[PDB]
Amino acid sequence: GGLVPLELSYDMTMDDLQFSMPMGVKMRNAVIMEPYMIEIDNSMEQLSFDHDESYLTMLDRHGKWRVNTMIKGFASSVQGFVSSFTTTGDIVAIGKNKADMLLAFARMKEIGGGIVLAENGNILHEIPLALCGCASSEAYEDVLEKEQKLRDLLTERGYEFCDPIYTLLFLQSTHLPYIRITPRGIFDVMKKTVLFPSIMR
């Protein structure tokens, strides 16, 4: 557990894992994304491993809003993956098992923020916020280790692009084409309009 956990005003529940919009974001490379029409049944607690469409939920750090969409091409067997290591402070949850996503979120809060990869009821890997980037040169090695391991695991589970941290960091960047996830919902960068909107929690 955590003596000093991330004191978010909310816990992530199954109600934050309701997916309904027919459109998701598809990775062209590590950062460039385009709209795509979801081709699979996004009502299931567990998604199949024979495709590369994963649930993606973006959650307000303050718990007011959330965006429930799909990301195609991030991975094909990531069960639960949560990161609070964003420049906005907002929370990203990606995966194919809603229970593992909830578990990774709870564990992320327990360790005081950061990155948590969970799988089949267990925590596969975690990086506390202090080790997600090299804030202190003293910790460089540790950072590197924590990072590389994460890479390896994500690469084993279908992440084929160069840098998943890059991906996560630029999901909300409305100046990079072609579609982004914003507090107002998914966002068409070229037409500068909200597509399907966010949900008030």
Numbering used by the authors: 380 to 580
Sentences from the paper on this structure:
Here, we report the high-resolution structure of the C-terminal region of YerA, which exhibited a compact architecture composed of two antiparallel β-sheets with no obvious close structural homologs in Protein Data Bank. Despite extensive trials, only two constructs pET-28a(+)/YerAAla15-Arg580 and pET-28a(+)/YerAGly380-Arg580 successfully produced crystals, after removing the N-terminal 6 × His affinity tag. While the former construct produced poor-diffracting crystals, pET-28a/YerAGly380-Arg580 readily crystallized with a cubic morphology in ammonium sulfate or potassium phosphate as the precipitants. The cubic crystals belonged to a tetragonal system, with the space group P41212, and each asymmetric unit contains one molecule with an estimated solvent content of 51%. Continuous and well-defined electron density was observed for the entire polypeptide chain, except for the first two residues introduced by cloning. The refined model comprised 201 amino acids and 101 water molecules, with refinement statistics summarized in Table 1. The YerAGly380-Arg580 structure adopts an α+β fold with a globular shape, divisible into two domains: an N-terminal β-sheet of eight antiparallel strands flanked by helices (Gly380-Leu550) and a C-terminal β-sheet featuring three antiparallel strands (Gln551-Arg580). These domains are spatially close, forming a compact structure devoid of central cavities or concave surfaces. Analysis by the PISA server indicated that YerAGly380-Arg580 does not form an oligomeric structure within the crystal lattice. Attempts to express various YerA constructs without this domain invariably rendered the remaining enzyme insoluble, suggesting a structural role. During the structural comparison of YerA’s Gly380-Arg580 domain with MAPDA, we found that this domain may function as a lid covering YerA’s active site, presumably playing an equivalent role to MAPDA’s α4-helix.
YerA from Bacillus subtilis is considered a novel class of enzymes that are capable of catalyzing the deamination of 6mA to produce hypoxanthine. Our deamination assays showed that N6-methyladenosine (N6-mAdo) served as a more favorable substrate than its base derivative 6mA.
